[PDB]
Design a protein around this ligand. Structure first.
Ligand SMILES: Clc1ccccc1CSc1nnc(-c2cccs2)n1Cc1ccccc1
Ligand SMILES: [Cl-]
Ligand SMILES: [Cl-]
Ligand SMILES: [Cl-]
Ligand SMILES: [Cl-]
Ligand SMILES: [Cl-]
Ligand SMILES: [Mg+2]
Lengths: 402, 557
């Protein structure tokens, strides 16, 4: 009944500190964990458990939901969920006209968790002003947010989905973490109807009584303006922008254009647009529209995402595994800097899950502390990507404008 | 007593067996002391005699007591501790006085013989075995093991605190309007009941405590306010830091100045306006603790103003959850910020200061925002919510900076408050190149080996200059080249560099820096009317950049 789980030897379990939480989130967690404990899903634990992973409260719309941050445990469990019991990622999912995401996390609480592993799922509800000891729990069943849970529930899931897949062989279903991704080429009404059906199947096992269009995902090319008149500044701007692309795209040319700058000219001076220039200029436009020749996804390597603040509520992003070899670039638009960044991250994470079955480590243009306090104010997803914090090179920002 | 409470199961670190340190031969007097002490403990269940078959051992010492004729036993648990499992931490933080709710009454109860009043996992006691040696090691010593939590064992603080929490659990459940703060072997108990019903709830609590092995003092022996705790002084309606005296000294050693700075930092959480900047500068460098440091005049001015601040007592007030929190920040200069947090105007719950720098170069708008972040996190810890902010910066200044800046930010609710010095942007870089402004193509280069370099520029108006620099890096020469351009240009000017590094610094509109140059550059940028800064790729045969490139490359590249 219980699948035994090992850490990656000889790593020890997670010992991550609990971030500070407001009163209302603390209160919300107390209610939630009090009930789960009654229902036997977690148990209070003693100081002989040295482990910890952070826990947060979010809204997904009026209700509070518990989000345990298992990023550390996941990293330390990676032999189990990726290697021993990996879940295959279909390349067909990104092709579908419509993909719907369904939360199936409630399924996990019905399976018991290996008793020798439960201690590593320890978490702590803090108290305001440290006036009472944190309330400490560990899990007795598969926890949501641990990558091991879908690895373990994997075989039960295919049992559950078998009739539906058999009846709908052109629909693609992919489980990632707590979510089910369901894609098809049906017209939107037929697709939505097929989702309700799927919910009914799920409902006989576990679920209560969100919609992508991946084939409409297309690159956000590096833009080369079409302009009335060009200044020396515009040209220099342009060479720096092409000169940058030349490090990514095979075949980019600038030679027949910097010839325009020759001399030591004033920035504002207007300049005649050459034929050799307007030729390669347009030819480079051809190159920038296409995917990068020579760049391929390596399943063994981590994904990185970089995000630039463009202003006007606009955000540019690139996903790559080796720097400047972009697998994907794009934009996100439309208040609040942190709320928007938070939206963009979730969206980029989602597309990344659809396309590769993997989550990006994000390089975030923000102060660690700002992000840390505010992000859960807006976070809706049930996973959390890895991130670090960087100060954006001001030029990189310029090169991905619109 | 020994608490009837369930024991916490304890393990040694995996792959490890218990300690086996050899007992050193003691003097007779120490052996007698030990025997007397262990006999008494043995009678009360604290320890138990074991056979010779227990392989494990831990050194026991005995030393004199406070200059009296009393003896005290000292076990050396270093080796067991090295072998015992890690535990969860006792405290994640400690209350700040400012976050304590206003309340009618607080009683402090301490636990008698705390560790010895709690049982040790039975399967683990064997590992705590020690031996009282016979006189000059003639015969087999006397061997005991612990039945309770040892003094100095790694597990004791945590298992003790968690035993107390389990025991408290039901009493707190049944008494929701009673609050208890656990600290070490003290228990602070507070409520809004009136004296009688409070002194009555304390007895119920004592009795519950007693039914479980924990003795506590009676009304006659309970300590009274003010409570002295973690450096604080806690009264029924106010709190302050414990008394602080700044010594009179003709001369200050490193050690005196460190202690001064420590006390000053500690006072700053309720005495507003404390500064340590100039006293800290004194501490820079590796000097002996006994070394005398003459006070600079700035440090002397600083000590005086701090002395004035501390001259009259100041106190903080407690927290009323039904009113808003207001946080005010003021600029104190030289990257120094001071704040206050209150609910009713100017009755502070606490104060603080912020004088950090993130990066080498920065501006007042970034710094103010970092201070707000720091104060936000602190408020959430202490009160569980963010304060309303009152800031010395204009709403338009702030949105001008952050809508334009490339990093994201967000501070919660704030209002402008006119408490100079106000924070403002001191210059603005142009967004477009300037017509009819000279265009300097600057550049700088340094020979890696020579460690000497050149900085210069070429102009579209045919002008030009080159200067030679010593001890310089490629980074410095590029800032220097930009500095030349600003020194030799008029009030409006376009500048074209190929140093991303330099572009970055200037682009961020710094008003203060660690670099001498950057400050010279900053002063220039302020004097100008318009500056436009542009970047070009080096060595791409561009425009004027090529000329100033070779002009400066010579000697050598
Ligand atoms: Cl209110 C009061 C009344 C009489 C004497 C001192 C005080 C202030 S000290 C205080 N205020 N509230 C508390 C408690 C909070 C939670 C349980 S008791 N305390 C005691 C306390 C002492 C040391 C650290 C934290 C709290
Ligand atoms: Cl363990
Ligand atoms: Cl619709
Ligand atoms: Cl979409
Ligand atoms: Cl690929
Ligand atoms: Cl001393
Ligand atoms: Mg004490």
């Amino acid at each position: 009944e219980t699948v035994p789980v090992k850490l990656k030897p000889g790593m020890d379990g997670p010992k991550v500190k609990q971030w500070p939480l407001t009163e209302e989130k603390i209160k919300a967690l107390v209610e939630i964990c009090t009930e789960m404990e009654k229902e036997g899903k977690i148990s209070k634990i003693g100081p002989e458990n040295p482990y910890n992973t952070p826990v947060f409260a979010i809204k997904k719309s009026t209700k509070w939901r518990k989000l345990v941050d298992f990023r550390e445990l996941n990293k330390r469990t990676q032999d189990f969920w990726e290697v021993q019991l990996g879940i295959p990622h279909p390349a067909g999912l990104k092709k579908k006209k419509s993909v719907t995401v369904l939360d199936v996390g409630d399924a996990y609480f019905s399976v018991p968790l290996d008793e020798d592993f439960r201690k590593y799922t320890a978490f702590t509800i803090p108290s305001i002003n440290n006036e009472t000891p944190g309330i400490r729990y560990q899990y007795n069943v598969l926890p949501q947010g641990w990558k091991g849970s879908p690895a373990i529930f994997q075989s039960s899931m295919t049992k559950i989905l078998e009739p539906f897949r058999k009846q709908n062989p052109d629909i693609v279903i992919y489980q990632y973490m707590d979510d089910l991704y369901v894609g098809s080429d049906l017209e939107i009404g037929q697709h939505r109807t097929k989702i309700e059906e799927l919910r009914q199947h799920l409902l006989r096992w576990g679920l209560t009584t969100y919609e992508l269009h991946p084939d409409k995902w297309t690159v956000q090319p590096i833009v080369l303006p079409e302009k009335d008149s060009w200044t020396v500044n515009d040209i220099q701007k342009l060479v720096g922008k092409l000169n940058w692309a030349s490090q990514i795209y095979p075949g980019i040319k600038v030679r027949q254009l910097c010839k325009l700058l020759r001399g030591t000219k004033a920035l504002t001076e207007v300049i005649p647009l050459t034929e050799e220039a307007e030729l390669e200029l347009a030819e480079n436009r051809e190159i920038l529209k296409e995917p990068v020749h020579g760049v391929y996804y390596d399943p063994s390597k981590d994904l990185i995402a970089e995000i630039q603040k463009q202003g006007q509520g606009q955000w540019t992003y690139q996903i790559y595994q080796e720097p400047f070899k972009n697998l994907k670039t794009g934009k996100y638009a439309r208040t609040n800097d942190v709320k928007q960044l938070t939206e963009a991250v979730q969206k980029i994470t989602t597309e990344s899950i659809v396309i590769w079955g993997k989550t990006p480590k994000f390089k975030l243009p923000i102060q660690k502390e700002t992000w840390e306090t505010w992000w859960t104010e807006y976070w809706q997803a049930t996973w959390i990507p890895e991130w670090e914090f960087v100060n954006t090179p001001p030029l990189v920002k310029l090169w991905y404008q619109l | 007593p020994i608490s009837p409470i369930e024991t916490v199961p304890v393990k040694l670190k995996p792959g490890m067996d218990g300690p086996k340190v050899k007992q050193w031969p003691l003097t007779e007097e120490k052996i007698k002391a030990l025997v007397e002490i262990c006999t008494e403990m043995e009678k009360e269940g604290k320890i138990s005699k074991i056979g010779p078959e227990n392989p494990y051992n831990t050194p026991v010492f005995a030393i004199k007591k406070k200059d009296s004729t009393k003896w005290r036993k000292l076990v050396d648990f270093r080796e067991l501790n090295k072998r015992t499992q890690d535990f969860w931490e006792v405290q994640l933080g400690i209350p700040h006085p400012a976050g304590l709710k206003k309340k009618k009454s607080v009683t402090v109860l301490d636990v008698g013989d705390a560790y010895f009043s709690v049982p040790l996992d039975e399967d683990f006691r064997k590992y705590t075995a020690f031996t009282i040696p016979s006189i000059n090691n003639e015969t087999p010593g006397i061997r005991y093991q612990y039945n309770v939590l040892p003094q100095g064992w790694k597990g004791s603080p945590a298992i003790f605190q968690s035993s107390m929490t389990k025991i408290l659990e039901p009493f707190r459940k049944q008494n929701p309007d009673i609050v208890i703060y656990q600290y070490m072997d003290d228990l602070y108990v507070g409520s809004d009941l009136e004296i009688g019903q409070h002194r009555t709830k304390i007895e119920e609590l004592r009795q519950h405590l007693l039914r479980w092995g924990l003795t506590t003092p009676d009304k006659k022996h309970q300590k009274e306010p003010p409570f002295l705790w973690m450096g604080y002084e806690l009264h029924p309606d106010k709190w302050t830091v414990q008394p602080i005296v700044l010594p009179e000294k003709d001369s200050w050693t490193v050690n005196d100045i460190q202690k001064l700075v420590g006390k000053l930092n500690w006072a700053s959480q309720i005495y507003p306006g404390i500064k340590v900047r100039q006293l800290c500068k004194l501490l820079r460098g590796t000097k002996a603790l006994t070394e005398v440091i003459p006070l600079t005049e700035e440090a002397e001015l600083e000590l005086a103003e701090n002395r004035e601040i501390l001259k009259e007592p100041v106190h903080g007030v407690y927290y009323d959850p039904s009113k808003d929190l207001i946080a005010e920040i003021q600029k104190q200069g030289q990257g120094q910020w001071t704040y206050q947090i209150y609910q009713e105007p100017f009755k502070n719950l606490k104060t603080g200061k912020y004088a950090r720098m993130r990066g080498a170069h920065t501006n007042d708008v970034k710094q103010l925002t970092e201070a707000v972040q720091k104060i936000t996190t602190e408020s959430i810890v202490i009160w569980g919510k963010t304060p309303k902010f009152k800031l010395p910066i204009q709403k338009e200044t702030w949105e001008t900076w952050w809508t334009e800046y490339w990093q994201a930010t967000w501070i919660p609710e704030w209002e402008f408050v006119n408490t100079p010095p106000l924070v403002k942007l001191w210059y603005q870089l142009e967004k477009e190149p300037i017509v009819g402004a000279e265009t300097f193509y600057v550049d700088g280069a340094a020979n890696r080996e020579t460690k000497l370099g050149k900085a210069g520029y070429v102009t579209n108006r045919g002008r030009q200059k080159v200067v030679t620099l010593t001890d310089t890096t490629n980074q410095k020469t590029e800032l220097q080249a930009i500095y030349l351009a600003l020194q030799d240009s008029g009030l409006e000017v376009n500048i074209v560099t190929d140093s991303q590094y330099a572009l970055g610094i200037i682009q961020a509109q710094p008003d203060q820096s660690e670099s001498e140059l950057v400050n010279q550059i900053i002063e220039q940028l302020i004097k100008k009317e318009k500056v436009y800064l542009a970047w070009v790729p080096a060595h791409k045969g561009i425009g004027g950049n090529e000329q100033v490139d070779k002009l400066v490359s010579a000697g050598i590249r």
